[PDB]
A paper describes a structure:
For further clinical application, the anti-L1R MAbs mMM1-40 was selected for humanization based on its binding and neutralizing activities. SPR results indicated that, compared to the parental MAb, the humanized mMM1-40 (denoted hmMM1-40) still showed strong binding to MPXV M1R and VACV L1R with nanomolar binding affinity. During the initial sequence alignment, we found that the heavy (H) chain variable region of hmMM1-40 shares 78.99% amino acid identity with that of the previously reported L1R-targeting neutralizing antibody 7D11. Structural analysis revealed that the H chain of hmMM1-40 contributes the vast majority of contacts with MPXV M1R (255 out of 259), similar to 7D11’s interaction with VACV L1R (236 out of 239). Specifically, HCDR1, HCDR2, and HCDR3 of hmMM1-40 contribute 77, 89, and 77 van der Waals contacts and 4, 7, and 4 hydrogen bonds, respectively. The HCDR1 regions differ at only one position (residue 28), where hmMM1-40 contains isoleucine and 7D11 contains threonine; however, this residue is not involved in antigen binding. Their HCDR2 regions are identical in sequence and mediate the majority of antigen interactions in both antibodies. To further characterize the critical interactions of hmMM1-40 and 7D11 with M1R or L1R, we performed alanine-scanning mutagenesis on selected M1R residues that form hydrogen bonds with hmMM1-40 and overlap with the shared binding interface of 7D11, including E25, Q31, T32, K33, D35, D60, D62, K125, and K127. Alanine substitutions at K33, D35, and D60 impaired the binding of hmMM1-40, hmMM1-39, and 7D11 to varying degrees, with the most pronounced effect observed in 7D11. We therefore hypothesize that the conformational neutralizing epitope recognized by mMM1-40 likely overlaps with the receptor-binding site, enabling neutralization by obstructing the virus-receptor interaction.
Residue numbers in the entry:
A (entry chain Q): 4 to 172
B (entry chain A): 1 to 116, 119 to 220
C (entry chain B): 1 to 219
The structure:
Amino acid sequence: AASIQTTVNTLSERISSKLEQEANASAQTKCDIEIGNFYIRQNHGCNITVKNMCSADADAQLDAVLSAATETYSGLTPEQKAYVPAMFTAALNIQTSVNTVVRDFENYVKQTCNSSAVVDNKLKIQNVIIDECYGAPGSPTNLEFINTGSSKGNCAIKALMQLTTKATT
Amino acid sequence: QVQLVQSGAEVKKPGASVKVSCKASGYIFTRYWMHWVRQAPGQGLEWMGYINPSTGYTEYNQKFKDRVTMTRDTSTSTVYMELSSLRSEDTAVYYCARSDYTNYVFEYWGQGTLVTSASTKGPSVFPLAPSSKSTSGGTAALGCLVKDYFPEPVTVSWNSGALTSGVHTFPAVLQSSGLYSLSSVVTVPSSSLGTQTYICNVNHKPSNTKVDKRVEPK
Amino acid sequence: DVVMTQSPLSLPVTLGQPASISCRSSQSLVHSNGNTYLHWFQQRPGQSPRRLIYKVSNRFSGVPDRFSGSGSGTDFTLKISRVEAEDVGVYYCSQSTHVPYTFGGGTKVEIKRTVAAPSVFIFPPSDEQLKSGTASVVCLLNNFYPREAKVQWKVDNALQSGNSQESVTEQDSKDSTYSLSSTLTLSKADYEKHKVYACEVTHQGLSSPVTKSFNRGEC
């Protein structure tokens, strides 16, 4: 669906703007962490590309990524907000309803990206694995990973990316 | 207004370890990276690495990949730096620097920390008395030896600050005792020697020593 | 690694005149992103670094426009249009394209002037110090330029080595000269076993080496 492609374009640009604004990001900022390899196990027509919008302050990055995702979702027709709990369950093993999604994605991000296995991961080059992705035949679903330069920040990006690629099914 | 406070000088025995530090002020700590540069005595600068204070990420020069360990403290805005297994060459000054917003330029430097032994002591002041041979009524040289003090600095004025022309106060040197030593000298007319009094004022603030030595002809 | 070569190493500069310093690199410094990450810094004598130019040409806040930078790729140039006495110092170039960040070896800028030979004076230990049980002999070479001088201690015509420290002042803001102080250090006992103490000085503006000396218990 084109609800997909134009919504990920909206959210990939809300991310970018908010990181610049709230975290003083730039594409001319030497990243601490670098997205190395990018791997789709079962790829049925998706391209993932990485975009560098790095910055020092990783909690600024987490809140900026929360703000973008709050908005983008709240900017959904109630009919298409209806489909979001199903993506939650399929990607994060979490149960939710439309009125609950914001607090529940919220509470998952800071549990998961404040955990010690994320915050204390200081390995420079980090890869991203997604299980599956489908695109329209002649229309590749084009996704963008926004590398924030931190491990705490990419953790929130990747979770969005997990929900998104599950939407393509 | 950005400000970088560093810890004072150190003297370690070969094979040991030292920890410099770097309190910060004036900017949102977590928003800027912190570097560390060392400068050997009479040598050029050398980059050691940096730290992100929001996260802990570090990136060392390989020359010290096993010996440096940059560290932070989001509460006290303080970035540490521990060099282990100190050799003789590791003796140098150590500055910490703040980055711009791209982690590509050094926008603010610290002040220095000479790592290379004694405790806090005040100096003995010794008269360097002018020569008897001199030269008629031409120019004569006298001075002060401000010997065996720690830490730095000391200030020296001449004649309660009224004597400025011809004063040379030399930079300190570290002696093998762990104490600094310093000379201060003024050249004056040979004629004024028996006519004018020359008192060198030495103020070493850490010990609150305050000595005023008259330097009288031979 | 990236090796930065600065040239020249020393630059006597007439007050108010131009001046140029050069920086070369062992690899190009133009980054993929378009910028060239070359920078210049000033170090005032014994002070800490002080920002100057970044990314080849832009100046930090509060930086006089007399300073100016240029170049491209792998050979860069810094230029002070008129050299005030406050610009004396060592200038360093740095790069940050290639981790690790690396600096050149520096260039010393000093005001130029005509050669001046030093005035020499020796100072035997003071009685007071000799009470304390140690003996310092001090030699003052005053107002000299160029900065390059040699000081030699001789105890009873015996060249000393390893027992003496020196220290030099900054170039003088008014007459542009240097001064140096060498300090011979001996135990009181060792001071007493020898009679003649001489300080011997070598420097361009002297046509033959100068010696100032004294005999224990005389001057």
